[PDB]
Design a protein around this ligand. Structure first.
Ligand SMILES: [Mg+2]
Ligand SMILES: [Mg+2]
Ligand SMILES: [Mg+2]
Ligand SMILES: [Mg+2]
Ligand SMILES: [Mg+2]
Ligand SMILES: [Mg+2]
Ligand SMILES: [Mg+2]
Ligand SMILES: [Mg+2]
Ligand SMILES: [Mg+2]
Ligand SMILES: [Mg+2]
Ligand SMILES: [Mg+2]
Ligand SMILES: [Mg+2]
Ligand SMILES: [Mg+2]
Ligand SMILES: [Mg+2]
Ligand SMILES: [Mg+2]
Ligand SMILES: [Mg+2]
Ligand SMILES: [Mg+2]
Ligand SMILES: [Mg+2]
Ligand SMILES: [Zn+2]
Lengths: 127, 25, 63, 214, 97
RNA sequence: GGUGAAAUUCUUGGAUUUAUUGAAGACUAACUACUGCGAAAGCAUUUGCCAAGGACGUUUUCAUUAAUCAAGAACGAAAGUUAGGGGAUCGAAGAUGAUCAGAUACCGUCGUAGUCUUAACCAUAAACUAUGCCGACUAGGGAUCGGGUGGUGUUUUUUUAAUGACCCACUCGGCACCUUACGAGAAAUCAAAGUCUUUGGGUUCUGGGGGGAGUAUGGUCGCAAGGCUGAAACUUAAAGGAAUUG
RNA sequence: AUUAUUGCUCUUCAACGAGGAAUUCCUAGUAAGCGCAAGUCAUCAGCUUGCGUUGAUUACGUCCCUGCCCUUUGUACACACC
């Protein structure tokens, strides 16, 4: 029915990326992260920073080739926080709303056979 | 003062007298 | 400019930090048989007819 | 000043034979110049998608598979096997508390001399009528189950290369002969081959490589 | 004096277990003594039940949620999440919800 | 990037993000739990090899061979020390960017030692259950872990069975949760902290107001940092415990 | 009675064009407009205490701010967080 890509969203704290590439990964198609479409450092990740992301690419997604695409949402994950940076939600809904055709996505962020001890140390980061 | 530092105080102290007594051996 | 009349089916609660938004269920006379929940900006009693300025939608709590 | 889209050679992808659809997705090269040409520069790339996206039915909601692209023949390019994954939302669904867990593994070879690594998993099924809320394993019941899993997992491969193992689990005949001998030791639920990965491939051999085409 | 007989948390017979690192404040606390929730949460969300399967292929789809286990550190646990602070009798109710 | 907000900081060297594979060292997520084991420190991927062990089973064997222990000895988390091997990661010093009236910190950054490992050391933890060890007795309940008994029990078929997991009665030995209070106590609570002025089963050890002080000294140990042992003068009316109301 | 107690007349004819950051008061004969009596008083109300006259738009909610309660909690304070 439609022509595919890979949507892949990496929503983190104090920024949110959004970029599609070729299904074989190896070849991009347009990015735009949150940190651009707004300027105020802290403001780098808020709801709208996302709907403002997927506006300057979902368009260009719908402008170079892709009419459809599957997403691979990602958290900073790792030895770090591993829990969804809010601005991925407000990005997806903003490419489901882009008219863009959605279908079949899973959780891709890193979760390990735990190791490489976290930073800040045994007393923890304290405040 | 905190048990640990007061212990440590008296151990740094302890070590200086070694030192000041070495001088005499 | 397709409008929508709404029959307050009953008074629910007062939502939203402030507390003037009033939770309510409104039926539609222009073909009943279905319920829709909406919020409001005024003081409201049962059987206040309302102007849904979009047919298909219903919110929840207000923050 | 460039905007490479007024430059990008453009392809669709072709899958092989032991499944459903062969035609796939779309991609981006660059003009097939002399020096930096659109043939042997790339192509080789790989692509993953769930298998209901090429088995059509949702009695196959997870199982991802990486396909290595091998050949080219004028603005078309084929692919062959490069490992199978799964899905988190099912792994994580299936990795549930108040129960035990088992996974064993083997390395092995095939008729066509690809060596790879396969895995497995299965979970203590609480048997209906079990008052006790945990259905637990006895280690000595796990190790012998690892053994049997090992018994089967190394008589299933070395059967006509990937193609034959490939088409040995797409309907998961294994998943039950696993469960076959398994009923003789304990219960068990789920019982899936989870992952598998390739690493030591033979030469291209472009005559038996084209098997799954047409 | 002892204002808890399961002590810190749950540790009778073992005598040592290993540090799990609190996800928000990054402390070290004995696995057992953690305090833990499960993050069963539908990957999409509230308003998006419509906008999803609508501009999406397949039939309805299925919907594939994501799970993560959150270990908190008291010092963390207190602050935000499940803890409150109880009276000298309710500190007994280990019961969930 | 990072943060409550920041900044130091990287970014023609396409940083951050993506894809293919490569390397190094550590670690063992999920299943992981009022559950298991070890004398404790402690111990979670696989299989092999090594020898070790509790419980049970037992109309098997020896027969008082035993209980507890000054000296003495085996073990001993973390750090720390010697010599290599390593060195990702996190990260005592040090430097830094913010912060503050100050801010040697808290936060951020950079990072030496260190973190792992072999050989040697070291012998400390709130090394905790702040609760010695063997023995007897004293009170209810449902759990659960290993062993065993029992069934015209259930679930698995093929041909009943034989397996295997289950279900249940009962039983030893485990970690525990509970209800009580015959009884204990200063009370918090405790099924042992019970059978204690109605004072005695066996045995080891420790304490005799608070400081001074675990200081000095002597002996000893260890490369060392330190360990073990370990006073007194003077001083002093409280210091202390559980619980009650502010 | 000058430093002008007040009052009257003519002349003079300011700023001020609805007020930033901010903060008060209040739910019905109330708000706010309006004047009068009373106090002080020899003289002097832009003050206050009560009076009536005209007489509204908006709530009949909540906890967001804010203040204050009340319960749990911790406590080494009891001359009680100066
Ligand atoms: Mg704090
Ligand atoms: Mg000299
Ligand atoms: Mg206390
Ligand atoms: Mg594992
Ligand atoms: Mg002697
Ligand atoms: Mg290093
Ligand atoms: Mg410093
Ligand atoms: Mg400075
Ligand atoms: Mg310093
Ligand atoms: Mg310990
Ligand atoms: Mg303890
Ligand atoms: Mg009993
Ligand atoms: Mg009593
Ligand atoms: Mg002295
Ligand atoms: Mg007290
Ligand atoms: Mg009190
Ligand atoms: Mg007057
Ligand atoms: Mg006055
Ligand atoms: Zn924490």
């Amino acid at each position: 029915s439609q022509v595919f890509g890979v949507a892949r969203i990496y929503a983190s704290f104090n920024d949110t990326f959004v970029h599609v590439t070729d299904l074989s990964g190896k070849e991009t198609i347009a990015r735009v992260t949150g940190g651009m479409k707004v300027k105020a450092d802290r403001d780098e990740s808020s709801p709208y920073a996302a709907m403002l992301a997927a506006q300057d690419v979902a368009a260009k997604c719908k402008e170079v080739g892709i009419t459809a695409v599957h997403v691979k949402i990602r958290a900073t994950g790792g030895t770090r926080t591993k829990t969804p940076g809010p601005g991925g939600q407000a990005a997806l809904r903003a490419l489901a709303r882009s008219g863009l055709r959605i279908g079949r996505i899973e959780d891709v962020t890193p979760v390990p056979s735990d190791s490489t001890r976290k930073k800040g140390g045994r007393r923890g980061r304290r405040l | 003062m905190r048990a640990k530092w007061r212990k440590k105080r008296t151990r740094r102290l302890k070590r200086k007298r070694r030192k000041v007594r070495a001088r005499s051996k | 400019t397709p409008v929508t009349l709404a029959k307050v089916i009953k008074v629910l609660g007062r939502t939203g930090s402030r507390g003037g938004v009033t939770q309510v269920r409104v039926e539609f006379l222009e073909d009943t048989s279905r319920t829709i929940v909406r919020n409001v900006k005024g003081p409201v009693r049962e059987n206040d007819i309302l102007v849904l300025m979009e047919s298909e939608r219903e919110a929840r709590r207000l923050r | 000043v460039v905007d490479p889209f007024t430059r990008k050679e453009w392809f669709d992808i072709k899958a092989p034979s032991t499944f459903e659809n062969r035609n796939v997705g779309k991609t981006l090269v660059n003009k097939s110049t002399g020096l930096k040409s659109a043939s042997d520069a790339l192509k080789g790339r790989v692509v993953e998608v769930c298998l209901a996206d090429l088995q059509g039915s949702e009695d196959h909601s997870f199982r991802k598979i990486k396909l290595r692209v091998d050949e080219v023949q004028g603005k078309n390019l084929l692919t062959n096997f490069h490992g199978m994954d799964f899905t988190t939302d099912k792994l994580r669904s299936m990795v549930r508390k108040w129960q035990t867990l088992i996974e064993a593994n083997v390395t092995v070879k095939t008729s066509d001399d690809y060596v790879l690594r396969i895995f497995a998993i299965a979970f203590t099924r609480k048997q209906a009528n079990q008052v006790k809320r945990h259905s637990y394993a006895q280690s000595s019941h796990i190790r012998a189950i690892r053994k049997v899993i090992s018994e089967i997992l190394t008589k299933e491969v070395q059967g006509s290369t990937l193609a034959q193992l490939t088409s040995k689990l797409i309907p998961e005949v294994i998943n039950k002969e696993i469960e076959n001998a398994t009923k003789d030791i304990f219960p068990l639920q789920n019982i899936h081959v989870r992952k598998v990965k390739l690493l030591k491939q033979p030469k291209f051999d472009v005559g038996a490589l084209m098997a799954l085409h047409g | 004096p002892k204002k808890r007989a399961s002590n810190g948390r749950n540790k009778k017979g073992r005598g040592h277990v290993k540090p799990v690192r609190c996800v928000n404040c990054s402390k070290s606390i004995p696995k057992d003594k953690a305090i833990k929730r499960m993050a069963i949460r539908n990957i999409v969300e509230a308003a998006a039940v419509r906008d999803l399967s609508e501009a999406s292929v397949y039939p309805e789809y299925a919907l594939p949620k994501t799970y993560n286990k959150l270990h908190y550190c008291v010092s963390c646990a207190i602050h935000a999440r499940i803890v409150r602070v109880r009276s000298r009798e309710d500190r007994k109710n280990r019961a969930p919800p």
